[PDB]
Design a protein around this ligand. Structure first.
Ligand SMILES: O=C(CCCC[C@@H]1SC[C@@H]2NC(=O)N[C@@H]21)N[C@@H]1CC(=O)[C@H](c2cc(CS)cc(CS)c2)C1=O
Ligand SMILES: O=C(CCCC[C@@H]1SC[C@@H]2NC(=O)N[C@@H]21)N[C@@H]1CC(=O)[C@H](c2cc(CS)cc(CS)c2)C1=O
Ligand SMILES: O=C(CCCC[C@@H]1SC[C@@H]2NC(=O)N[C@@H]21)N[C@@H]1CC(=O)[C@H](c2cc(CS)cc(CS)c2)C1=O
Ligand SMILES: O=C(CCCC[C@@H]1SC[C@@H]2NC(=O)N[C@@H]21)N[C@@H]1CC(=O)[C@H](c2cc(CS)cc(CS)c2)C1=O
Lengths: 123, 123, 124, 124
């Protein structure tokens, strides 16, 4: 994978959450997420996908991943997906937007989903 | 997994796309996605997560998954994430919202990400 | 004068049973009231927005958006929704939207400030 | 009369270099112009929106939103953006927003009609 080495490792966002990911040659993302906010504690499984053969025109590398907020400690009956791109260079970044959906009744489904944006850096 | 059987299988959305997924007892989602629209053809790997122990109060089951739009045929330098919930009963549904991010230059990153919503049914 | 001024103007209903009453101006203005069937809302709220008053003539819809702040003379939910979408004319006219609802929060909770969803409005 | 009428009113700039000039009314109205540094845009466009004119007094921000349709006397991009966010006062005042930009599309292409993003506005 072109950016397999760039992506693999530990990332931190502006909330102080910690994302540890392995990128596979085949496009796979696997790892763990630890949120510094919300109904969450310790690590949660994450899985996702990335473009393992990106353009070489200066564009970023598209990726996404999911966390369902159940681990051996807690269950927040919810899942977040991050969609974004990896940008390399002196100062690498993963810029994302996310969707967090909670399980709701049918009557409350209109208010099921939060949206936001996280920027991840290596330091 | 509570809804392991409900989720596993073939789903279709309002665009005529086809999602085939296996839910694992541990929360895993694995399968393939085939879009009926956009810069896509044949199947793409998908991975994601679901709440394997949801509430039993009538609420839906939170889940999400990712597709990176590279397979052995095509590469659209982009990834979609779906965030949503599974709703069981007579007429089962997965109601989602999604984020599609394309790799862009830095100058064009403001226009990197589409948002939309897909509803999946079994028929 | 606005191409779809007459199409847009009027009363619309969404899948939740909410009611959207809007006047489109020749200049691109949208003005009206919204009444939500759900949430911390009662009676009508002011809305204002904008639409493309000179759209393409190629089968494309007509881009528009509007905002409601959820304060009126009855209640205040310390929040605002924006709908962004397009109007699609014809037999079965529709306004297809996605929306963002932001509540006022502390700094610490701002990650959790904004709901997203989608509403489809029809005339009947 | 609006609690943050004086805080909101004025000129704001985002991380792209766009310029947002807005007057907040006592009644919850927002009126002004937007000039984008990016995209199919040139010069100023009308904006209208709403804000919570009686917010909580507990550290929470002030919910607001506005719309711009991307048609003026120079150009038409057949599209509209809505910003949904909150104003946060103090030393380093900010309006933190997420936005939806919908273009007019055919029915067949409507799945690809809407961009989403986030803008942070400051006074300097
Ligand atoms: O809280 C959660 C799970 C944690 C989600 C953290 C997010 S992912 C996007 C962003 N990026 C990060 O690095 N961290 C945040 N779910 C839901 C959402 C929520 O508000 C909720 C919740 C419920 C209750 C009991 S009713 C209390 C609280 C406050 S702790 C949160 C959840 O139970
Ligand atoms: O097209 C794609 C990949 C397919 C995405 C299909 C989406 S997932 C959310 C929704 N739900 C579904 O079941 N299907 C749709 N990427 C990007 C997006 C796009 O517009 C773009 C594209 C580029 C070009 C050449 S510049 C042409 C076209 C028209 S085919 C699309 C892509 O290349
Ligand atoms: O509830 C509100 C205001 C109403 C918003 C209705 C939305 S506009 C997008 C969609 N489309 C429609 O036609 N109707 C819905 N704000 C916030 C949102 C919310 O969840 C919340 C809320 C607070 C409380 C007590 S703090 C209780 C409830 C349940 S009534 C909702 C708010 O107080
Ligand atoms: O470009 C426009 C209008 C300008 C929108 C600027 C956005 S509002 C959210 C963000 N925040 C800001 O302060 N500025 C940006 N519409 C659409 C969007 C787009 O990609 C598109 C476009 C079309 C064409 C030819 S068809 C070329 C280009 C590149 S100039 C963009 C449009 O024609």
């Amino acid at each position: 994978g072109r950016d397999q080495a760039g992506i693999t490792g530990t990332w931190y966002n502006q909330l102080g959450s910690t994302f540890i990911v392995t990128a596979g040659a085949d496009g796979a993302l696997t790892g763990t997420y630890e949120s510094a906010v919300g109904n969450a504690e310790s690590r949660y499984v994450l899985t996702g996908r990335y473009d393992s053969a990106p353009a070489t025109d200066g564009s970023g590398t598209a990726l996404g991943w999911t966390v369902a907020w159940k681990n051996n400690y807690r269950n927040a009956h919810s899942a977040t997906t991050w969609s974004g791109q990896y940008v390399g260079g002196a100062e690498a970044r993963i810029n994302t937007q996310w969707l967090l959906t909670a399980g709701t009744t049918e009557a409350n489904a209109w208010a099921s989903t939060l949206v936001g944006h996280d920027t991840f850096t290596k330091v």
